[PDB]
Design an enzyme around this catalytic site. Structure first.
Site, mmCIF file in Angstrom:
data_model
loop_
_atom_site.group_PDB
_atom_site.id
_atom_site.type_symbol
_atom_site.label_atom_id
_atom_site.label_comp_id
_atom_site.label_asym_id
_atom_site.label_seq_id
_atom_site.Cartn_x
_atom_site.Cartn_y
_atom_site.Cartn_z
ATOM 1 N N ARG D 32 0.793 -1.069 0.020
ATOM 2 C CA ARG D 32 -0.086 -0.080 -0.020
ATOM 3 C C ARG D 32 0.844 1.404 -0.034
ATOM 4 O O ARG D 32 1.773 1.486 0.838
ATOM 5 C CB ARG D 32 -0.900 0.109 1.169
ATOM 6 N N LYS D 220 -13.033 2.716 -0.540
ATOM 7 C CA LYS D 220 -13.155 2.851 1.114
ATOM 8 C C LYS D 220 -14.508 3.585 1.655
ATOM 9 O O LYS D 220 -14.887 4.633 1.369
ATOM 10 C CB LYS D 220 -11.731 3.736 1.400
ATOM 11 N N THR D 278 -8.471 -0.298 8.949
ATOM 12 C CA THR D 278 -7.645 0.605 10.044
ATOM 13 C C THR D 278 -7.487 0.233 11.447
ATOM 14 O O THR D 278 -8.664 -0.394 12.023
ATOM 15 C CB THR D 278 -8.473 1.869 10.002
#
Lengths: 433, 464, 464, 464
Positions: D32, D220, D278
């Protein structure tokens, strides 16, 4: 030991006490009385003998009365309305299907027809008007006396002939109720396409169904008759209503002391379809070998029952309860399901799932102790009183061990209605003897 | 359309091309040649005729050669007259084939009737017409006691319950009939009175000696020994004929349905055909319509799960043979109609052929196209009673005819199949061609790929 | 309404009647009394405040006494001054309780520290602040090499991951605390550091000794040895408290979730309460909302199947106790609302109670009414995670109180039920008057009949 | 060992070929690049560095561009000093980006603040640090009442719980990021703050205009609008990333897990990859082992059924980035290990692919070889959580790259497959060659035959 029940038509060669006791021993459960013959004092005595054998031995049996119902037999026809109720193009048939005629003209007191097929017409043959609807009463002033005799004697079941629709049933039932026979069960005999098409409605009105495939056959395509049978047995099992399989059972045995292999297969398949009871007509009534027929019939039942399984797979209370009772029984390997009944519905409700276990059904009701004799795998038991749910549990634990149907340490599932009215089955209870 | 197949015993009342065509038109699938009667010139012609009609029309059909098998007959009586036997009477069987009989004694064709039978056993004459338990044996004689009243004619059959009859599997004549059949190239041979595994292997060894290596052997279980050996008999054969009439003589009556139901069930599991045979619509030898009891018997055997139901005398010599095939076809149609697929140690073929049927069903495919060499995969799909027609493509002519005996399969001879994509390509052309399906129909396709002929291992879903 | 029970630790900032009453409103079911802290006079008034709120309101709650437990701690440093340890340095623990430690050496409270430990063993000090590896055990010394920099303070806890510690089942004060527990008639005792069956048996003996034989022992599983012997521990206990934080400083992290999930599962199966305990909403000790991660972890523990979730310092001593209970309870209702029953040797009780829930579900019953003496048949019904509430009627108070800890049961105390029919009459009365169900509603009723306490044998369906 | 994939954020402390290589060894599958940081030369070198390691080793990885995305922030404070805000005080935000604020006013970057907001709305600043409720909006000012005490620093994030914000799909630098993304031929693009279908349709048009049509869009989901539009967002995306921390500051706590599990459920059913993103192991930025609770959170996200689990700061800017990858991977292997296939509107691919996994399990196949053009059939077979590894064969190198992100698929770029049998032939060579399966293993093989790209319609079983 066998589970499906044997109905035996009893006539003068077989009516003695000594024979009736023999035939109960060979596995007879219900005496059928076919009033297409005889005189009342004879029949009245035929009943007493069975009822004597019953006291004398401790065996239970049920009594079932047959009604003949409506018939229609250039020739001269018994039925005055033949010419009215028939219609242009209609298909008349004579002598259980042998000659079919198509109606070309009806003038006056004459139905003139064109013969569709060759055949040898004789004396007193059957006329079938397939499709055509007949204005004859279900129960004509002539068979009505039979019924009244029946209420008087207190028979358990009445099998009513040539049922074509709801109305018919209701008219047998309004007769019975006019004479104190309101607690007598009506078995409807589906013998025609009309009754066949009206079956579901005939079924809701009746207490049971007699599948007379011989008679039915005359009226509908051969390749449809087993499927009629199967449907009607299946519909009866669901509704919790007894179904007898009745015609052409072991007919060869009226001449022989051994059945055709095709008869045996045919009796075994009906049991496999799921009947409650199999019927013996002339084999037990008129033939030369009646006690042979009951005995081979009983081995066929016993051999067939013993390989069959249970059948567990708006939703109602009694249905949930009684399905759980059998599911739990077999899970716990119980020999018995012991049931408290008033009119029998809940012993019938348990039986619908084809239990491995025997249903031992406790009633204080005499009629329903008898009537239950016709239900598959059910052993009825008249008790003096069941005063409570705990008393029921306590009593049935005694009668189960006492029955020899179970022993100490057996698990037994007990089924009943508690704080509900008669209509309902609502509590199940497992016990170790 | 009907999924169960009809085997019809053709006789001289039906052997014509114009009548055979009519029979194929009423729904006959397999022609049975009963070599318990007739001659080689006649059967030879009956074969050529069918082969001519099949050529003339483009219908497919199988040819089944039924052996007469080992028998024990009583022989001739005095002046050729029936004698009247009676219960409690002594009767005596003699091994002397020239003693002419009366009501005291007959001779039996079987030389070892004593050597085999045993004091106490049951002997029954004329298919169970008369019963007799043995009370003694001496010399060449079985001294019996008669248990019921009957009349003894000449040349009657003897049923020996229990008795391991050491008769051979193949009769004197049976070998030459088999040889005729290998020569003619028949597809199936139904062999009578199979008692054990060895009996099968003796027919297979006979056929193999004569170019019959590819002929399928249908074992007829007709007695208790054969029943007791069923599993092993079935491992050895390619299929089974349930002979109910015969077994009815040989075992207790309440056992026969169950002997039948048990045999059909195991045949399905084994992926081998099963014919339900005797006592079907026998009344139709005099009557143009069947019993309600007969049509019922037939429906219950289809529901039990046969591939095929069989007409004997009703199409061979009866007076109404084309009527039998038609009412037997409508019973079939009606019964298959209301039957379901049955889907509920690993086997790759079971695995794929069960999937391919479960998928066909969920996707509503009209067809399952299968590719075969010897019929196994089409037999392995048929085992779960698909709704869908199995169209089976072979380049093998024999297994193309053989497959005509299996439930709801339609065989089709193809030139070659060159690869898995070619199969998919060719089977779609023929699926459309067959009229069994149409554009936008799903079709499951089953086959082997990079495997030897034993195995079925791949499936493929196609939209036409 | 929520079905999983909330245990709230009660300390001085929430011990008041007014506050206790609010919390009962918010979702408190069980008061936990943590005996790491406070005196008997305090806990006594604590117990008294809640009993008076239950009097005054008719709310029911339970009282769970949590032992402090036996431990190994480090002791006192020179001057009371924390020391800084360096990665790689040597460091020594001494069994000698007179030694005032420093940067080279401490004393630990456990005499069996040298015995229990081994060369190569890891010692964790202060909640895994500092780790060290045993390099040699000599005399009353365990000599270690420090695995990471950290600051050692006085009186710190020590974890010996993987090691069996022969500490006693109960600390001395623990035994003195338990007798207070009996006097005060607490409903549960959660016993800390449970390693083996014998520990549980000891504790049971202690309570039995002081009239506390009806008090339920909840065994706290806090380390590998305990996890090792979990089955035999759960057998001997009345239930389990999964202490996640302790397990996370004792066994590999990747194991702790499956420790949690295994133990909740076997408790459910054994029909025994499980409490998910440490590290729940600790952030709310300082803030008025939980973390995202905190809220997920509680939710996942309820979905695992706990009866009860625990608050500790965040309802005892934190700055937002009442917000903690409330959001705890909103996570509870939110998660319960989406769970399904779990229906799929065979016993009578399990058979009956699973039929009860299954039938209840089929018939759309809002309520299953059970009559209990010792709580079992309510717990046996709770095993299948019903949608219906369980009204459990007892004449036994202790059980009416202990059943408050069980997922989705509403206990209630009755004069008597005289018979089975009496039961069905009584439970319909209380079912209607509870407002949990109304006229027309079906109600499955569960009980034991002609059986002794142990057994649930009967089941009835009723419309109110 | 493990099946679930690890996305790792590569930053300065981790971008080197030596590091990236150990990363790959430890469990890394996807790099990422978080474009909230770093110039194009940097990311460009990281890209190259990784492609070197892959070339020089034969390892596969994918590369994922994480956009910064649009934001509302607070702006500059007087003298640049933090101002402490007090509960109950009045506080105003101004759309005037000229204003320099203090303890009563700040400017925001977002001109639509006044439009989008409503009296009574909640405004949060600095990741939920200070919350406030709108009391009035006048001119370019949103006058608030501060809900709790806190120091507002400069340049802080603002979240508007439950409000539809009309920020555009893409920020201006985002578009320039996505263009670099195309030049670089990254494999995925995780787009930030996606709240309606139209946003995705835009991002797709932007990539398409720059030759990035083959790049997969992972949307997202960061707030309540995204969540209410998730069905149409998922439908126009190639995949999803669940941003839990953000959802935590935007929607009710007790709701966040369920949001996660719902979205993982729906991506599985849709045959599209999902990343759980996250606050996974953030503690490991400062610490060399993770939290109990952190370990649990990862495990649950895996049992929910994620393809991939994501590291952020831990691998980018942490102290222990390789510790993080390792324990993340041990958590993966440990959890994947205990999960089961999921077998139990009527479509072709779904049927073939379920059957294959289904058949593989019955026959215990170590391996399912799939042939894919754009990866769909790999992702279709993956939907049922096969125990077996999917070895996925492509001539297309982008899909061989993107398939790196799919749970338990092992991508394999091959030079061609010319036919179905050519497939079966090559798939066994590679299956054996791959060390995943061995001589005698069953291998199920899934592909399309006589069909365009879209469809998986054939499956075959093979012994190696």
């Amino acid at each position: 030991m066998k589970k499906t029940k044997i109905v035996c038509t009893i006539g003068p060669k077989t009516e003695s006490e000594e024979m009736l006791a023999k035939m109960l021993d060979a596995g007879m459960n219900v005496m059928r009385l076919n009033f297409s013959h005889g005189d009342y004092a004879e029949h009245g005595q035929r009943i007493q003998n069975l009822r004597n054998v019953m006291s004398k031995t401790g065996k239970t049996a049920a009594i079932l009365l047959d009604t003949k119902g409506p018939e229609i037999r250039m020739v001269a026809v018994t039925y005055e309305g033949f010419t009215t109720d028939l219609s242009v193009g209609n298909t008349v048939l004579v002598d259980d299907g042998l000659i079919g005629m198509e109606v070309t003209a009806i003038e006056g007191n004459k139905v003139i027809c064109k013969v569709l097929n060759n055949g040898d017409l004789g004396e007193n043959k059957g006329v079938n008007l397939p499709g055509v609807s007949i204005a004859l009463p279900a129960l004509a002033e002539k068979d009505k006396q039979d019924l009244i005799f029946g209420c008087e004697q207190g028979v358990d079941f009445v099998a009513a002939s040539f049922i074509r629709k709801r109305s018919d049933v209701i008219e047998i039932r309004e007769h019975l109720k006019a004479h104190g026979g309101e607690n007598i069960h009506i078995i409807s005999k589906i013998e025609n396409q009309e009754g066949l098409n009206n079956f579901d409605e005939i079924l809701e009105a009746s207490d049971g169904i007699m599948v007379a495939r011989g008679d039915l056959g005359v009226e509908i395509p051969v390749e449809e008759v087993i499927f009629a049978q199967k449907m009607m047995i299946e519909k009866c099992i669901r509704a919790r209503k007894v179904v007898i399989t009745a015609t052409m059972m072991l007919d060869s045995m009226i001449k022989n002391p051994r059945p055709t292999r095709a008869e045996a297969g045919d009796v075994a398949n009906a049991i496999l379809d799921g009947t409650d009871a199999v019927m013996l007509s002339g084999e037990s009534a008129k033939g030369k070998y009646p006690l042979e027929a009951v005995s081979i019939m009983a081995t066929i039942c016993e051999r067939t029952d013993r390989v069959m399984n249970s059948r567990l797979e708006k939703l109602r209370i009694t249905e949930a309860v009684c399905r759980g009772a059998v599911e739990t029984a077999e899970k716990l390997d119980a020999p018995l399901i012991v049931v408290a009944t008033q009119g029998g519905k809940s012993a019938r409700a348990v039986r619908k799932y084809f239990p491995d276990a025997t249903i031992l059904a406790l009633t204080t009701n005499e009629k329903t102790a008898h009537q239950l004799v016709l239900s598959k795998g059910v052993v009825p038991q008249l008790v003096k009183e069941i005063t409570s749910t705990d008393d029921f549990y306590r009593l049935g634990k005694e009668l189960a061990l006492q029955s020899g149907l179970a022993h100490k340490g057996d698990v037994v599932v007990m089924v009943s209605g508690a704080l509900v009215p008669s209509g309902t089955t609502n509590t199940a209870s497992v016990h170790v003897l």
